[PDB]
From a paper:
Most instances of MN are associated with the presence of circulating autoantibodies against a podocyte cell surface receptor, phospholipase A2 receptor ([name]). The [name] autoantibodies primarily bind to a dominant epitope located within a 31-amino acid peptide in the cysteine-rich domain (CysR) of [name]. [name] is a member of the mannose receptor family, a five-protein subgroup of the C-type lectin superfamily comprising the mannose receptor, Endo180, DEC-205, [name]. and FcRY. All family members contain a homologous CysR domain, fibronectin type II (FnII) domain, multiple sequential CTLDs, and a short intracellular C-terminal tail.
Residue numbers in the entry: 38 to 942, 952 to 1381
Amino acid sequence: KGIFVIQSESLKKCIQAGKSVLTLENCKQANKHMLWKWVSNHGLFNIGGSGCLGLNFSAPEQPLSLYECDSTLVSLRWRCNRKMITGPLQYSVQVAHDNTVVASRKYIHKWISYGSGGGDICEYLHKDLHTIKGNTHGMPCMFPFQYNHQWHHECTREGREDDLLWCATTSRYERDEKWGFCPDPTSAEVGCDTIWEKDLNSHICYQFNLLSSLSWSEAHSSCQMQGGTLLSITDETEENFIREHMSSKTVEVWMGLNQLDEHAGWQWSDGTPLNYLNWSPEVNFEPFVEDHCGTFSSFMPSAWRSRDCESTLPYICKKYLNHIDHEIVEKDAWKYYATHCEPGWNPYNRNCYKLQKEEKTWHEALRSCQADNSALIDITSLAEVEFLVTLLGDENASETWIGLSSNKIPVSFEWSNDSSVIFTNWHTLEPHIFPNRSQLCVSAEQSEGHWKVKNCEERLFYICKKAGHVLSDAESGCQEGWERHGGFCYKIDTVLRSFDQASSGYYCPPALVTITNRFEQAFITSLISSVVKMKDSYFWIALQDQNDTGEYTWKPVGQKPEPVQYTHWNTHQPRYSGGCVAMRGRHPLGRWEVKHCRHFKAMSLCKQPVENQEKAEYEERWPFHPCYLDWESEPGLASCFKVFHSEKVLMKRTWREAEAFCEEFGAHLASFAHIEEENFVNELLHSKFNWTEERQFWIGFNKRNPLNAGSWEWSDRTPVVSSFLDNTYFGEDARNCAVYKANKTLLPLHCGSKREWICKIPRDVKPKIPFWYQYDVPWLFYQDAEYLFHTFASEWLNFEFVCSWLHSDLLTIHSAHEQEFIHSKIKALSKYGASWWIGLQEERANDEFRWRDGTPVIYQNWDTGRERTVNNQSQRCGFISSITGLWGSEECSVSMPSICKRKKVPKQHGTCPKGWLYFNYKCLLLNIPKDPSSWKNWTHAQHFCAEEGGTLVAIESEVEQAFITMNLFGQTTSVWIGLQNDDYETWLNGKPVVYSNWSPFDIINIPSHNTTEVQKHIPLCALLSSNPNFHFTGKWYFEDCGKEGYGFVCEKMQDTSGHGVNTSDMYPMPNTLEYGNRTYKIINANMTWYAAIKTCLMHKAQLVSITDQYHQSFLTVVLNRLGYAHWIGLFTTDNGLNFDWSDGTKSSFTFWKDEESSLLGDCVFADSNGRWHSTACESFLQGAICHVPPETRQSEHPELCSETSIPWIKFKSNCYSFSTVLDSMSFEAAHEFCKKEGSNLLTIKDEAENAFLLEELFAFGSSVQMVWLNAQFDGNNETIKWFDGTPTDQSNWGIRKPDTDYFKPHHCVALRIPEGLWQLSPCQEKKGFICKMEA
Ligand SMILES: *[C@@H]1O[C@H](CO)[C@@H](O[C@@H]2O[C@H](CO)[C@@H](O[C@@H]3O[C@H](CO)[C@@H](O)[C@H](O[C@H]4O[C@H](CO)[C@@H](O)[C@H](O)[C@@H]4O)[C@@H]3O)[C@H](O)[C@H]2NC(C)=O)[C@H](O)[C@H]1NC(C)=O
Ligand SMILES: *[C@@H]1O[C@H](CO[C@@H]2O[C@H](CO)[C@@H](O)[C@H](O[C@@H]3O[C@H](CO[C@H]4O[C@H](CO)[C@@H](O)[C@H](O)[C@@H]4O)[C@@H](O)[C@H](O)[C@@H]3O)[C@H]2NC(C)=O)[C@@H](O)[C@H](O)[C@H]1NC(C)=O
Ligand SMILES: *[C@@H]1O[C@H](CO)[C@@H](O[C@@H]2O[C@H](CO)[C@@H](O[C@@H]3O[C@H](CO)[C@@H](O)[C@H](O)[C@@H]3O)[C@H](O)[C@H]2NC(C)=O)[C@H](O)[C@H]1NC(C)=O
Ligand SMILES: *[C@@H]1O[C@H](CO)[C@@H](O[C@@H]2O[C@H](CO)[C@@H](O[C@@H]3O[C@H](CO)[C@@H](O)[C@H](O)[C@@H]3O)[C@H](O)[C@H]2NC(C)=O)[C@H](O)[C@H]1NC(C)=O
Ligand SMILES: *[C@@H]1O[C@H](CO)[C@@H](O)[C@H](O)[C@H]1NC(C)=O
Ligand SMILES: *[C@@H]1O[C@H](CO)[C@@H](O)[C@H](O)[C@H]1NC(C)=O
Ligand SMILES: *[C@@H]1O[C@H](CO)[C@@H](O)[C@H](O)[C@H]1NC(C)=O
Ligand SMILES: *[C@@H]1O[C@H](CO)[C@@H](O)[C@H](O)[C@H]1NC(C)=O
Ligand SMILES: *[C@@H]1O[C@H](CO)[C@@H](O)[C@H](O)[C@H]1NC(C)=O
Ligand SMILES: *[C@@H]1O[C@H](CO)[C@@H](O)[C@H](O)[C@H]1NC(C)=O
Ligand SMILES: *[C@@H]1O[C@H](CO)[C@@H](O)[C@H](O)[C@H]1NC(C)=O
Ligand SMILES: *[C@@H]1O[C@H](CO)[C@@H](O)[C@H](O)[C@H]1NC(C)=O
Ligand SMILES: *[C@@H]1O[C@H](CO)[C@@H](O)[C@H](O)[C@H]1NC(C)=O
């Protein structure tokens, strides 16, 4: 129970709010009245007050009061620096002269907790519980939430007949029904789905969290919170069990398998070893890419795949029920037993070992070990790995064969002895299965004991293990020490308590402990776990920062310059400089923490030294010249740095992209092992740049690995010395990477951002690119772009990056003429005459026609010899033949050569003829005929424009496109445009196509023809889509120039022979505007986002909500007229994940300026060109856009919408079920299922419901492709009708659809969910279905 009472540090009073504004009162029994808690949004929810502390930024001077956290009127966010309560814009709660808080920037003030006296108020900072299932796709609980006329701050019971705890995903349960069950480990009886009692005694339970699209990090978290763990596929038997026992056969789920540690190989998130593997080539293998997490599907093949962990997918949790003592798998694995052996052999704990240094094949080495009563080594515990690395400490001992190998095509790894596997230490990339060899054998490397597979025929050294028996009960190492380990002994005690302070000597004569390796850390963890006398204790460690510097370091024994090479910090633990390190005893055993040396209590640790004196440590000649002259560093520093201020010319880079760039030079994203390094890099930055903070640079500091304790780490393996924690502003889990700034400071960030960076390299530069082909760039002679022919063999999943580093990401073709030039050059006689890569990319088995450049593939030059080039999506990368130049697709890793390119070698207002619309120094006609007889084909409409004095529109810019779209609202007739398939890049008027709005699909998909075969004989003509679906609305495609059925837009510059009548539209600023079927108010005052919300509410309107591209287009013209930004009603309670509209309308429409712009803040505004931007809500902008809403009223029992049995989502007056979406099933079967359920198969009756569904189903992503629509296709008619007889008005097809495709047994129509189009399909296919009913 995290509730607390908050007291002023400087004044013995606390916040017992009371009515209206809160007040400072004595902590009398009113502590039993007013208490405080942290909730979903950072705000503080005052229990009893049933409120939520807010700050009115329009007038901060007013005393603070309690609001409803659903309120958008006031800023409710709060932040916690050291014992502060800090609001946005530097404000903070702070008592005025009077005893009432006036949160102000005036002066600092500090707060602490009553009761326990917690020195930090934020000891109970909120953590988000992800709901498992029941009405929502696994969102976090939103606290507090309004149940029946009352607020709740914790998961509750009342709502569900069943007694499991539940919560709401949205602030008000009554208004929105998105509830969900709450994680709980206690309710195992109903907490988990299926008990697989088949195991001997485990009674292992499984929870099949389908429907719960989550990132891997959140899935792992969720599974943990109930006491379970992400799925571990121990063996084929359990894999096949789950294969059948899961229900929705078409889903892909998270497992638990991962390679999140870039320095370690694939591993189960749980403690299970990775011995059984079912990798499938369905995913393409590359070592560098971000596919770090493992996905499993119950398809016919036994296949696992690699995905990006942030992707949202369902998952499965795994929990053993009998293992209460599971904290450590083995209890006595670390205790040393006095061992003896014969000459040549080295004794280790209770065993004999010997390394032969005789290169042998695996079979040869096994037979050699068998020559004696010995077998190749088997590793049972990390202690054996420690001994392995110690022995490989032999003079060369680079690698050794391990007594472990595979003997199956579906690989399962077993020892050379018929015994089970208990541990695995796979190297960074070496669980890699050589395609089909029957047996692959593992060798261990000397660096860390990392294992890697390879052909068993390889000749390598080998170590034979042998039995032994205890020599005696003596401990010759340190009889006085409590235990021995390796080359030291340990004498922990739970009596002496101060931080090593002793009258003489120390608590033990060798003083406090120092940790150099994870092996040592594990041993001491075992020690503490063995001697936990009283729970959650702490133990002192020699690491301290008493000479307050931030760079915590060991307390040095005599003249010892003891460095630090390993650390075990707790969650976001290395907070503040100064103090001493204490290691935790609570069940997260062994984690380190910082503590106060005069106030904290911890117990004594000891390290009896090596019985043989150690020699001198280092030579230290290396800083003579740490790196080549190319890189920068102090002479004397241990590493070198290089700052990358641009890409190609001035372009930035994502975090992982910059890291890969450092890697291809051999370096890492920079890291600070020392305050000296940090200061040196700051000084370098300020030597390079001005008195500016305009530049933010990437660094290695990151948090991308969540399976370990959530805490930051350097990508370079250097340990994190304390207090480099960028800021106390932690908890922003959405941000996972970090950036550096001048004045010695760091900022958390989202790794998806783009920035400049800096790489660090200790000793040796390894250029992989050498900046190839430094003068083969100039090719303007042929086109307007400069090309480059990369003759060096390279696969372009990576070479796209290097290609971008000077040019486009890859070459892309948009002209038969440029293709002729490319063929002429590529017709090279030498090895350069091989096939060549191009930017042509495939994203699915379908969707094989997108450039990685991002442009749609509008021009075709395929070779027709291989139209079946899919190879289960492996062949996804395009290439051109050297002999003909015809294209082809290939598996991307083949790494043939490639190419690159890059795109750089009187406006007076006037009169507008009648009927035309004057928009921007020009007039548009926008002829949309109402008569079929009046329709013109493109080659005719050109005549009309010419005779009228203009030409077909040339859409020069997004504002022109938006104007045309807004002047095309209700006319569902597409309209010609003035560009031709002959040249996608030049408008008919003769100027380049800089702007473009090509449709995502069907650009050349003429229904009456093949895509390509007859197209090459037919001219094609541009055409502006009038489709009412925002994915297509105002988009461009092509159609037969001779076709008819489409209007035309003529353009002609304004007639300047007279008044500049554009003033008639420029001058007026109508306070109210009408468009489509709604009315807008343009406010033009100085205000924040909250102020704009309040202003719209003080008006009768509400802050605008933009649900479609038509309204977005109108607002684009409006804002272009106004000339400056305005607020809009889009905001997010959570940082940059998913925004919501202030007025509560749901729509998937989004019009961001750029992908990263979504992340720059919490409240959204619109640019002068309409494009959206996120930003801090406290910013001040000179206007806003309100819209008048349609008024409606509600019933008394709409909460009837959902029962306790089924996940029913309420929308307006009807409920939809989405659980059935994944239940792939046939048409009539779905019909009958809904019928018997007491509902009807989905019916799209209005645009509001259409948009609501298109948004809601986006939560499942690619988990479903199509859904059945309850519409009958008439037999001898083209008509389509809902089961209720209502017309099919809402129907939509990207291009006008002929009925000629349905079979006599009528085809049945479904909804292509990712894009929203309709499509008739064979009626017996298996698809998802959605029931719907009234509330
Ligand atoms: C829209 O209205 C808001 C209303 O708040 C307005 O924001 C306010 O702007 C003023 C002016 O920038 C801020 O006042 C400043 O606050 C700082 C706080 O440290 C003071 O230091 C400033 O005084 C110093 O600087 C002055 C010259 O800049 C000197 O003359 C003076 O002697 C001091 O040296 C100054 O008072 C005010 O803080 C904000 N409001 C909030 C809540 O922060 C905003 O600017 C308006 N928008 C537009 C476009 O005008
Ligand atoms: C887009 O639509 C275009 C409109 O149709 C044309 O309209 C013109 C109006 O003046 C007509 O002149 C033109 O036909 C002319 O035909 C004469 C020869 O006359 C014979 O053929 C016509 C049909 O072409 C027939 O109606 C007569 O009775 C007679 O048998 C010819 O010498 C001229 O050059 C014109 O072609 C209409 N038809 C055509 C085909 O031009 C049309 O022009 C255009 O082709 C359409 N777009 C595409 C891609 O076909
Ligand atoms: C946050 O602070 C702002 C600014 O101090 C508050 O705005 C003010 O709210 C009052 C109402 O409490 C407004 O008074 C009303 O003005 C209208 C104007 O037409 C008048 O018709 C009413 O009879 C009444 O007098 C006041 O104008 C308004 N001032 C501004 C600059 O907007 C706001 O109420 C505060 N909100 C919260 C939740 O504390
Ligand atoms: C932190 O950043 C600043 C700016 O990027 C670094 O330079 C400092 O910049 C400020 C102006 O922003 C300078 O102040 C000016 O000083 C002159 C002195 O003649 C004065 O006439 C001006 O009116 C103004 O006050 C400041 O001097 C300057 N200091 C230095 C050392 O360059 C600053 O160095 C950065 N600090 C760190 C630790 O990186
Ligand atoms: C190990 O072998 C290398 C050559 O393979 C040799 O240079 C080196 O001196 C040997 N000893 C050690 C300790 O590396
Ligand atoms: C391991 O090898 C020994 C002989 O070295 C053998 O007796 C034993 O059975 C093997 N392990 C198992 C589980 O059988
Ligand atoms: C498959 O395994 C055999 C083992 O003899 C090996 O020669 C071959 O290179 C492997 N790969 C393929 C594609 O056959
Ligand atoms: C700081 O370091 C000096 C040695 O240079 C030492 O004598 C002194 O006690 C240290 N002070 C603290 C607070 O650690
Ligand atoms: C910094 O900018 C000022 C602008 O006045 C200029 O005088 C100075 O030379 C610049 N210095 C550097 C290092 O860019
Ligand atoms: C994969 O190949 C098989 C033939 O072995 C084919 O039946 C299947 O359709 C392919 N997969 C896809 C997604 O096309
Ligand atoms: C083109 O469409 C026709 C339709 O009859 C079909 O016969 C032919 O095989 C198709 N060719 C290609 C290359 O798609
Ligand atoms: C505008 O919306 C109202 C809503 O009741 C509807 O009755 C009216 O027909 C609509 N007008 C147009 C032109 O769509
Ligand atoms: C075709 O449509 C008409 C209504 O326009 C309807 O009466 C008739 O039954 C339909 N015929 C078939 C075969 O569906």
